[PDB]
Design a protein around this nucleic acid. Structure first.
Lengths: 49, 18, 49, 320
RNA sequence: UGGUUUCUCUUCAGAUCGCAUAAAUCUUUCGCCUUUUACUAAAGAUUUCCGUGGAGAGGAACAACUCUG
RNA sequence: CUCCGAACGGUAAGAGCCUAGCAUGUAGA
């Protein structure tokens, strides 16, 4: 058991560090598939239409 | 694995130090 | 008839009207106790001198 | 042979009662006041002008945008006629003094549409740079960047029933980004074309959706494809649905096909005319929304003529 | 029925809440203008700050002096 | 008749040598 006691900082101060250049999350995603419709050719006259 | 408890901090710190 | 008293009475009556002509709001507010939060901190301390 | 074929819904055909043409350019947005008195409608002349909802006469003219006004969302919970311009500025023109009051910014390109949430005090500004924006009303600051689209987020929907915010992406994939988190909770396995239309029928069912090619219905809890749309292959841009069961589809080709939200068959499927000063193939319904009294339909065409379609009683319109 | 004070925190303020009155921002106007900020003040509405008003919650001082009824 | 202005738009450009008022408060054996 460890008690989580938040330290009350001084409410008048410059920030302790600069702008954080650390990566917050992961650039991979959950790439969900489309599964909308089977893509196929229209017709032989589709190139002329 | 974190597992918090709703026990009092006063009685817990007094019993462990005794 | 001073020449200094005429424009000084005109300008003092100018800001008397202008602070009451358009500067009449109902003056709503929501927040309070600005410096009272610093007195309740763990670092400041009140005294008398 | 078809299921639920001999029992369709009832839908009498409509008729145009007045064609107001006062704007200078293609009208891109149209909205009605909740008091059924004002009718806010933008144009390509960078001037959001309000007109009478019933009389049709002009009521006001409010300019200020630097590009085409492609969004006008009149807030019903607060007196503020917020507008989305294409000059990367969501000019929240409050109607309390007929001027800009907020002038919020943050988008990197043009804004496609804006929708005011009925419960949360925030405005969902569907931009077109790379994502939408959850702008906080009366705070002049963004809440979270709901980046869940691979293209421009055209449509937007802020429903109180749906916990997420239904965003319509032009990358052929609709998404439902949550308000608290921001990530898309569920995608859409439909709408193979660039989806730039969305609707909602909260009268007796869940909120539907739409698409230009091969449109289909949906559901509010996590999505559920009920049925597809009829034979409307044109580029649909306006999709309105009334509480009486009418489903109006406004396409860019001018074929304003009106169908039923329950039956699905096209009741009227009529095509509108054009202005004499306009070209031959220029009439297209870019925005359409029903009135606050749900009596006279209002569709803003691309031929610089805000047309109003009233109702008419008839009985010789039985569908097979 | 029964408590004069004082300090903390929770709302709405449409009462000259302020018997007095600052700054910034937004939309329109004038004067200079030579790049710009510092500029001049007329109109309107949005914040911040100097402050305040009733009504529940927790401590200290005689709460007991017995206040109105 | 007594209404009083401030900054930017400004000193360059470089070679070799020389000296300075500054800052952090660690885990480890």
């Amino acid at each position: 058991v460890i008690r989580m006691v938040e330290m009350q900082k001084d409410p008048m101060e410059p920030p302790r560090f600069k702008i954080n250049k650390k990566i917050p999350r992961g650039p991979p995603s959950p790439p969900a598939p489309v599964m909308h419709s089977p893509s196929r050719k229209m017709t032989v006259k589709e190139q002329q239409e | 694995y974190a597992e918090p408890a709703h026990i009092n901090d006063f009685m817990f710190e007094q019993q462990r130090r005794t | 008839q001073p020449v200094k008293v005429r424009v000084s009475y005109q300008k003092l009556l100018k800001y008397y009207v202008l602070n009451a002509l358009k500067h009449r709001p109902p003056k709503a507010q929501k927040k309070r106790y600005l410096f009272r939060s610093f007195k309740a901190t763990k670092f400041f301390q009140s005294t008398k001198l | 042979k078809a299921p639920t074929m001999p029992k369709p819904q009832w839908h009498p055909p409509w008729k145009l009662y007045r064609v107001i043409s006062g704007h200078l350019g293609w009208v891109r947005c149209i909205a009605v006041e909740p008091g059924n008195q004002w009718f806010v409608t933008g144009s390509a002349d960078r001037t959001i002008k309000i007109w009478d909802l019933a009389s049709g006469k002009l009521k006001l003219s409010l300019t200020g945008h630097i590009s085409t006004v492609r969004g006008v969302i009149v807030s019903t919970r607060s007196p503020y006629l917020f507008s989305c311009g294409e000059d990367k500025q969501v000019k929240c023109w409050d109607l309390e003094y007929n001027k800009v009051i907020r002038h919020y910014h943050g988008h990197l390109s043009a804004v496609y549409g804006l929708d005011l949430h009925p419960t949360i005090d925030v405005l969902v500004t569907c931009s077109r740079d790379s994502t939408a924006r959850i702008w906080d009303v009366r705070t002049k600051a963004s809440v979270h960047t709901l980046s869940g689209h691979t293209n421009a987020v055209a449509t937007v929907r802020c429903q109180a029933a749906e916990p997420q915010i239904i965003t319509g992406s032009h990358d052929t994939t609709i998404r439902l980004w949550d308000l608290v988190a921001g990530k898309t909770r569920v995608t859409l396995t439909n709408h193979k074309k660039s989806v730039r239309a969305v609707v909602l029928h909260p009268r007796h069912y869940t909120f539907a959706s739409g698409s230009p090619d091969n449109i289909k219905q949906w559901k509010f809890p996590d999505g559920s494809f009920i049925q597809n749309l009829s034979g409307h292959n044109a580029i649909i841009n306006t999709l309105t649905v009334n509480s009486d069961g009418v489903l109006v589809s406004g396409a860019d080709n001018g074929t304003m096909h009106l169908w039923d939200w329950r039956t699905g068959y096209n009741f009227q499927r009529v095509h509108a005319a054009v202005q004499p000063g306009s070209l031959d193939s220029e009439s297209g319904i870019f925005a359409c929304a029903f009135d606050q009294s749900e009596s006279r339909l209002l569709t803003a065409e691309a031929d610089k003529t805000i047309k109003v379609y009233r109702e008419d009683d008839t009985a010789t319109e039985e569908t097979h």
